[PDB]
Amino acid sequence: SRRARIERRTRESDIVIELDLDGTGQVAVDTGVPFYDHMLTALGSHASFDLTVRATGDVEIEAHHTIEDTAIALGTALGQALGDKRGIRRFGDAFIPMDETLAHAAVDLSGRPYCVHTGEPDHLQHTTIAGSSVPYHTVINRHVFESLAANARIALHVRVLYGRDPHHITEAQYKAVARALRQAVEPDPR
Amino acid sequence: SRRARIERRTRESDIVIELDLDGTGQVAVDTGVPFYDHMLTALGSHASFDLTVRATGDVEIEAHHTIEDTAIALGTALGQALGDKRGIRRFGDAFIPMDETLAHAAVDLSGRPYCVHTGEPDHLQHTTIAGSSVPYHTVINRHVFESLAANARIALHVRVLYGRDPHHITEAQYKAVARALRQAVEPDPR
Amino acid sequence: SRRARIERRTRESDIVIELDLDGTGQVAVDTGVPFYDHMLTALGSHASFDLTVRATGDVEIEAHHTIEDTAIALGTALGQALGDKRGIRRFGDAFIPMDETLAHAAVDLSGRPYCVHTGEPDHLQHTTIAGSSVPYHTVINRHVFESLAANARIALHVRVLYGRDPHHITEAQYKAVARALRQAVEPDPR
Amino acid sequence: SRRARIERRTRESDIVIELDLDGTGQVAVDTGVPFYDHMLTALGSHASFDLTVRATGDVEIEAHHTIEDTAIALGTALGQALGDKRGIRRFGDAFIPMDETLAHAAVDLSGRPYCVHTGEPDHLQHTTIAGSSVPYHTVINRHVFESLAANARIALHVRVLYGRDPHHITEAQYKAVARALRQAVEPDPR
Amino acid sequence: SRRARIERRTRESDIVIELDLDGTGQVAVDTGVPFYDHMLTALGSHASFDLTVRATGDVEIEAHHTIEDTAIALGTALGQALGDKRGIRRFGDAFIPMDETLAHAAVDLSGRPYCVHTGEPDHLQHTTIAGSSVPYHTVINRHVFESLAANARIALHVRVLYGRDPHHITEAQYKAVARALRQAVEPDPR
Amino acid sequence: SRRARIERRTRESDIVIELDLDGTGQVAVDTGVPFYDHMLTALGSHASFDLTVRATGDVEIEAHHTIEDTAIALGTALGQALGDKRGIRRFGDAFIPMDETLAHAAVDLSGRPYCVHTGEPDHLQHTTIAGSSVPYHTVINRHVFESLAANARIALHVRVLYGRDPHHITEAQYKAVARALRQAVEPDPR
Ligand SMILES: [Mn+2]
Ligand SMILES: [Mn+2]
Ligand SMILES: [Mn+2]
Ligand SMILES: [Mn+2]
Ligand SMILES: [Mn+2]
Ligand SMILES: [Mn+2]
Ligand SMILES: [Mn+2]
Ligand SMILES: [Mn+2]
Ligand SMILES: [Mn+2]
Ligand SMILES: [Mn+2]
Ligand SMILES: [Mn+2]
Ligand SMILES: [Mn+2]
């Protein structure tokens, strides 16, 4: 009923998205950026979507292009699956405690495209989360949320109230967005 | 079941209110202050009330008296329709993103009459929203919320977290109050 | 006994005042500036005067000239009605609470002409109170009180202790002056 | 003529009030909070009311609930005894010197419910007045005045100009309110 | 009924006071300090007392001793004339505008002896008011009020809200005290 | 289904807890610290738990040990009743307006044990709430929330946005925690 398949071929990347709004958290993500995969899996699971993401891009340069193209495509998919947006709650919000971190997200699904991102500590502008593969630079977080909001055509406010660890700060934000979205897309019985 | 009709004749104004708490957003407002009508329509619609407001007053002087008398009457109507307040959720809260603005409202329907209004930028104390008719001075916003809280006998906290445009700041507040109220008045299944 | 009729024809305006100090609050004011009419009605009523004011002036330019000429004429009328000022209380003072606002006025009816106006918030220097007709600029408040004091030949101190809303701040001042005057003009039984 | 009897049974407390506005200072107060009794006796005496207060409540927890319920009931009684408020002075004010302390109160009996409480030193937010029984926390002072104003439906401004001793600061305020009220409720011969 | 005659012989001075509280402003003062005479005449007149003061002292040294002894004696006279203080208003207050100056006094006639003097500009600590005879140093003002309060056994608060001219500041204070006293000593019809 | 009985014998105290998560607000608390009883009753009622608490301890020393042991035991009971935490909402949050106070709590029931307590005014570090029995020191509030979070093994964030009265600040926090918990423990229909 509320599904979408989006294919996006750029020079930098090739993306396929499959999205079902009324899912059970069946998620499979593979972008070539493992930390981003972890974040998108959290997003899909906590939003209770069914989500498949397959992306290959120029990760030799860095993750930026792949991360950005995926967020654009995912936003487009969300917009298409939403459709006319009839009989939904429309507004949603969620607080996410994650150890010392507290994050908040609020959404308006019918409101004009807009993104406000506040409260993130200054060291996240140059922090890197690195494992055995392509690293993730936390400066991209804002870029991801802006891209989603612009392509889904929604109002999205994301706040970090406080926090220290960049893994916790980042993960809390992705989960807050997911749970705000989940509440907003649900049918309203009025 | 939860209805009220209030008539209020003062020297300044004459008001009739009809309110149904368990409505479908059937709203008709005419006060002679078009921007106030827009705000009250948002209130009634987003609260899912059925609301009819008819007001005539001394708008040649300014909107103040009409705006204030209407808010007093509407508060009285809300109080009467609430009744004994049995088996309701009682507490309600809502975040409203509106472009760059974010507003929040929290209510306690059984709590003693109280109003706290914080966060509004300083230029709203002397801003005017003007069209082709009677203008609206945003300094009145606090007055409207205080009057409602006092006459409905409820605790009402309204916060502006941030924002720039006075139309957005004002509208976000009215909508936040509406959605907080909607949540609070709903039957609690416990 | 204590009555006065004053006619004042300038290039800007034409004014007629009728004043009885020992009245019952029978007041009729028409200046072409509705908010000023509201303020002068409050003045006459709360002072327990009988007061008729009829003024036409160059309101196409703005209210300034009409407001100023009326205040000058009203001051002259007050002075004439007071006469020799024999056996009156002479000193009067009053506090006026008006919602969040508190204003104070003190008068000496035999004291030399003087006016001190303090405590008014800075935004009142450029605030406008506007309805469906000629607006009122709150910067004129000081001008009105100075003009009255100068032409009645009295000492008049007006203070705003605190306040927010310009309608409340302005109305509180007019009422404070009225009640200070009422106390001062009353016969002293000593 | 201007009398009221109010009974108020809550879970926390049980209150009976008997109030005559046109009394001779015949006062009998018993709440189980001796310092509060002293304050209410001062109130009734200095206002020239006849006042009987009988209250029992959960003083094992603390005085808060009993003090608050009594103030609510007393406000209700004042409102009822006032009635239509015809031919009264309406405005009243009083300065109370008490050793080093100076307090002031101003009232408008027909003005909309409002309370402003300013000037109290910061140490009164955590000061206790303790004898051989249930103590009194001076932080409650504001709560008492707000409750009275809200339930009597009057404008009440209470200011402490300066002072040091908490017994003097508290007692001065109660007496200032009493004498402001006394002036306001008196018949106006105009 | 309320009269007193006080004789006070010190090494510095010899004083005779005759005071009637229920007078018509029949005042005759001669201390050898002309400006002080002017001030005491204002006091007696505005309080509506009948007052005779005759004082000779060591004015070759300066006015201090004469001014102080007279104030002590006058306080004693006021105390004696007051008597048991039965059926009086007890509390009194007055605002005195004098050109640019505004002064205030509040009294409690049954309250314990106390004097608070605030608001006087700093240049009054070394200002002199000089004519053709013995000059008056405005630093003495506080001393005069303290002495009166201590010997009459009353609470007396004197405030200067603002002002510039030392003659106006001083005279306003003496008149404020007089009118506060007048109100307080009057019979209370309750 | 979701019940727990916990017995805890220390040297300082002896505690018995009985907890049902799926209750109707049937609460009975007796610790020997009346204000704490009031707070725990609010907790149990607003969380819609069925809760029996029986505690005796060394209250002659002070409440600390009894308050702490009870919170530890209650946390343990909550943890046991939660069990595997299958099919619950997991996240919960609530705003509580209480007169001038606004408090907020957010919980993650599966998140690692953590407690963050922010926003409480500084005077609560040395404020006492005292009645006719064992008093309550508000400095303990943080200790209570930390103990609960540690023994239930949950993430608990408690914030005071603003407030003045210590009774209101404290009660608002306990109620916020209760309503956050209520939301989190409820079955999730997804
Ligand atoms: Mn980019
Ligand atoms: Mn992780
Ligand atoms: Mn108003
Ligand atoms: Mn709009
Ligand atoms: Mn001019
Ligand atoms: Mn008005
Ligand atoms: Mn309370
Ligand atoms: Mn005492
Ligand atoms: Mn000396
Ligand atoms: Mn002079
Ligand atoms: Mn401990
Ligand atoms: Mn309580």
H helices then E strands: how many in chain D?
A: 4, 10
Q: Which of E59, E89, E119 is the last residue of a domain?
A: E89
Which of the 8 DSSP states describes residue C123?
G
Do chains C and E have 3 or more beta-carbon pairs under 8 angstroms?
A: yes
Sign of the Cα torsion B102, B168, A68, A184 reads: positive
Q: Please choose, from the candidates E187, E136, E184, E181, the residue with its C-alpha nearest in 3D space to the C-alpha of residue E44.
A: E181
Q: Please choose, from the candidates E71, E81, E79, E142, the residue with its C-alpha nearest in 3D space to the C-alpha of residue E110.
A: E79
Asked if C73 and C17 count as a contact pair (C-beta separation under 8 A), the reply is yes
**For every residue of chain A, which 3-state class applies, written as one string?**
CCEEEEEEECCCEEEEEEEECCCCCCEEEECCCHHHHHHHHHHHHHCCCEEEEEEEECCCCCCHHHHHHHHHHHHHHHHHHHCCCCCECCEEEEEEEECCEEEEEEEECCCCCEEEEECCCHHHHCCEECCCCCCEECCHHHHHHHHHHHHHCCEEEEEEEECCCHHHHHHHHHHHHHHHHHHHHCECCC
Sign of the Cα torsion A12, A18, A24, A28 reads: negative
Q: Which of A95, A102, A169 to mutate to test the interface with F (most CBs of F within 10 A)?
A: A95
Give the position of tokens 């003002």.
Answer: E141
β-bridge pairing E3-9 and B155-162: unpaired
What's the CA angle centered on D105, arms D100 and D111, to 5 degrees?
170
Q: Tell me, yes or no, whether F40 and F132 share the same domain.
A: no
- The dihedrals phi and psi of E104, each to the nearest 5 degrees, come to -140, 145
Q: Tell me, yes or no, whether D76 and D98 share the same domain.
A: no
Q: Please choose, from the candidates B111, B57, B123, the residue with its C-alpha nearest in 3D space to the C-alpha of residue B85.
A: B111
Q: Tell me, yes or no, whether C184 and C133 share the same domain.
A: yes
Do chains F and E have 3 or more beta-carbon pairs under 8 angstroms?
A: no
> In this structure, how many other beta carbons lie within 10 angstroms of the beta carbon of residue B59?
23
Q: Which of E99, E159, E160, E182 to mutate to test the interface with C (most CBs of C within 10 A)?
A: E99
Ligand 1 center–CA A15 separation, angstroms: 16
Q: Which ligand is nearest to the CA of E101?
A: 10
Q: Please choose, from the candidates A27, C179, F79, the residue with its C-alpha nearest in 3D space to the C-alpha of residue D93.
A: C179
| F50: β partners | F20
Q: Is E107 on the interface with D (CB under 8 A)?
A: yes
Q: Determine the distance in angstroms separating the CA of A179 from the nearest CA of chain F, rounded to an integer.
A: 10
Q: Which ligand is nearest to the CA of D57?
A: 12
Q: Is F99 on the interface with D (CB under 8 A)?
A: yes
Q: How far is Cα of residue D142 from the mean position of the Cα atoms in its chain?
A: 10
> In this structure, how many other beta carbons lie within 10 angstroms of the beta carbon of residue C110?
13
Q: Tell me, yes or no, whether C77 and C145 share the same domain.
A: no
Note the residue count of chain F.
190
Which residue segment(s) compose the domain that F7 sits in?
A: 1-89
The residues, any chain, with a CB within 8 Å of residue F6's CB and separated by 6 or more, are F15, F16, F17, F19, F73, F74, F76, F77, F80
What Å distances lie between residue D30 and D5, D53, D56, D129, E141, CA to CA? Answer: 16, 6, 8, 18, 46
What's the CA angle centered on C105, arms C102 and C108, to 5 degrees?
165
Q: Is B7 on the interface with A (CB under 8 A)?
A: no
Q: Tell me, yes or no, whether B165 and B105 share the same domain.
A: yes
Q: Tell me, yes or no, whether D58 and D140 share the same domain.
A: no
- CA dihedral of E116, E117, E122, E126, whole degrees rounded to 10: -110
- Give helix C140-152 / helix C166-185 axis angle, nearest 10°: 10
Q: Which ligand is nearest to the CA of C65?
A: 5
Q: Is C64 on the interface with B (CB under 8 A)?
A: no
Q: Tell me, yes or no, whether F166 and F184 share the same domain.
A: yes
What Å distances lie between residue C56 and C18, C133, C148, CA to CA? Answer: 15, 14, 19
Q: Is A123 annotated as a binding residue?
A: no
CA distance A57 to A7: 14
Ligand 11 center–CA E164 separation, angstroms: 61
Asked if B112 and B155 count as a contact pair (C-beta separation under 8 A), the reply is yes
Tell me which chain E residue has its CA closest to the CA of residue C104.
Answer: E95
**B134-151 burial code (b ≥16 CB/10 A, e <16):** bbbbbbbbbbbbbbbbbb
β-bridge pairing B27-30 and D13-20: unpaired
Which strand (E) or helix (H) includes residue D137?
strand D136-137
CB-CB neighbors (< 8 A) of D112 in chain B: 147, 150
Which of the 8 DSSP states describes residue C88?
B
Q: Determine the distance in angstroms separating the CA of D140 from the nearest CA of chain B, rounded to an integer.
A: 15
CB pairs under 8 A between B and C: 42
Q: Tell me, yes or no, whether E43 and E94 share the same domain.
A: no
Q: Please choose, from the candidates A91, A116, A114, A119, the residue with its C-alpha nearest in 3D space to the C-alpha of residue A103.
A: A119
Q: Which of E89, E118, E142 is the last residue of a domain?
A: E89
The residues, any chain, with a CB within 8 Å of residue D133's CB and separated by 6 or more, are D32, D33, D34, F132
Q: Is D64 annotated as a binding residue?
A: yes
Tell me which chain F residue has its CA closest to the CA of residue B107.
Answer: F97
Q: Which of E74, E89, E104 is the last residue of a domain?
A: E89
Q: Tell me, yes or no, whether B132 and B106 share the same domain.
A: yes
CA distance B155 to B136: 26
Total number of domains constituting chain F: 2
**For every residue of F70-135, which 3-state class applies, written as one string?**
HHHHHHHHHHHHHCCCCCECCEEEEEEEECCEEEEEEEECCCCCEEEEECCCHHHHCCEECCCCCC
Q: Of B24, B96, B100, which is closest to A116 when you measure between CB atoms?
A: B100
Annotated binding site of F: 12, 38-46, 64-68, 90, 112, 143, 167-175
Q: Tell me, yes or no, whether C18 and C72 share the same domain.
A: yes
Q: Tell me, yes or no, whether C186 and C107 share the same domain.
A: yes
Structure method: cryo-EM
CA distance F77 to F43: 14
Q: Please choose, from the candidates A71, A29, A43, the residue with its C-alpha nearest in 3D space to the C-alpha of residue A175.
A: A43
| A160: β partners | A103
Do chains B and C have 3 or more beta-carbon pairs under 8 angstroms?
A: yes
What's the CA angle centered on D110, arms D104 and D113, to 5 degrees?
70
Question: Which positions 153-172 of E are in contact with D (Cβ < 8 Å)?
Answer: 155-157
- C-alpha gyration radius of chain D: 16
The CATH code of the domain that includes A59 is: 3.30.230.40
Q: Tell me, yes or no, whether F26 and F2 share the same domain.
A: yes
The amino acid occupying position B27 is V
